[PDB]
């Protein structure tokens, strides 16, 4: 399995997970965040449900998760601030626009990029 981690873990983290799982046959996916959050984005769960996908029930901080369990932790970084995690394990970095607040169609645009990237990533 792979781990999609972003900062607040409410949208992107959750999007990549759901899309990954709908495309991967053997690999599975989970998500985590650097900081706490109460709810998963409503725009996201709507957008995923519109695609027949259920987002994660509740954001889970990366602290409540033992990283070594994963075999590829993909990190969804900001425009210029990729967070590093405590693992000599394999980890990539995806610079993806933060849809938060922007709402509107920007979320869908973010969804698509994540999809183009997950699709490509699911090559292996």
């Amino acid at each position: 399995k792979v781990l999609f981690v972003c900062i607040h873990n409410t949208a992107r983290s959750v999007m990549a997970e759901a899309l990954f799982n709908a495309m991967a046959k053997s690999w599975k996916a989970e998500s985590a965040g650097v900081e706490k959050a109460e709810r998963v984005d409503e725009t996201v769960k709507r957008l995923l449900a519109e695609r027949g996908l259920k987002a994660k029930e509740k954001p889970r901080t990366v602290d409540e998760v033992n990283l070594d369990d994963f075999d590829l932790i993909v990190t969804v970084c900001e425009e210029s601030s990729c967070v590093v995690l405590p693992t000599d394990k394999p980890v990539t970095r995806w610079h993806i626009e933060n849809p938060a607040g922007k709402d509107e169609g920007t979320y869908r645009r973010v969804l698509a990029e994540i999809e183009e990237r997950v699709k490509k990533l699911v090559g292996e």
Copy 2:
């Protein structure tokens, strides 16, 4: 000058700046964050005002700031997720408990640590 950067930039980032400036003679300080935030913590501005300190007017993302201007960017990291910045410049990491939400006296405890660390840091 030094730059105190944390994720959301609402409390700690702001605390260290204000305390630093009240202790440093020649050096000055600024703060920035990895992600957007509308307001500076009310507990903080209260806590600083109680010490005769005005917190920053509004959180400024590290994106609206050209890092090279600084000479020591101290990064206030989480329990296990120190964010890295785009600079071959000097940067440290302070693992400081996130007071957010916890409110109560936890904030003051966080204030004290930041103070113990800023005081020490102001050695140079």
Copy 3:
């Protein structure tokens, strides 16, 4: 393809490459180093040739190589000094004893670990 990079690129880097290729069906491998080196270790080429493997002809610095070509750059780090490369791409870290100088059977022990790790890594 995967890229095995170490500092001087004379032994381990070269070992992992040759073993990987002898085990991977679809993926291929290459190697590179942080600093220049004139010759590939004689102990290694002997040790690989003893296993029917030809080591790389000459060490190639990671500078003479465009990283983006690869899809997983595994970094063979020291006891406490994992070098980071200029890529938002996926990269792991293997703490492997430096056989250099130690010669004797230590090289073979290093060969075995790299093999245990490559074998495992070739899972995907």
Copy 4:
């Protein structure tokens, strides 16, 4: 004190140290390397002795050194491979041409840059 660490620790690491010490009043300096080396460069000790400076007696790997002792570890990185050390402490990165082998006057050129940088760095 500050710590100047490079890969092999034979030239640059040693140059910065000696120059630093000849310029700093209160701060002191030491050097360390990522990998073992038997001798300190002869071009360097000549070059420093020509300036009335004695280079380090023998290269000391960063492993034989407890990092926390220092208060600013400057890392002399390559064209594209800055090594990271095991410390949440403050550390910078200097991209300095590797004089090794090039010999000739290139060493002096490297000496000068390090000097321009140490001079500047000794501001604090």
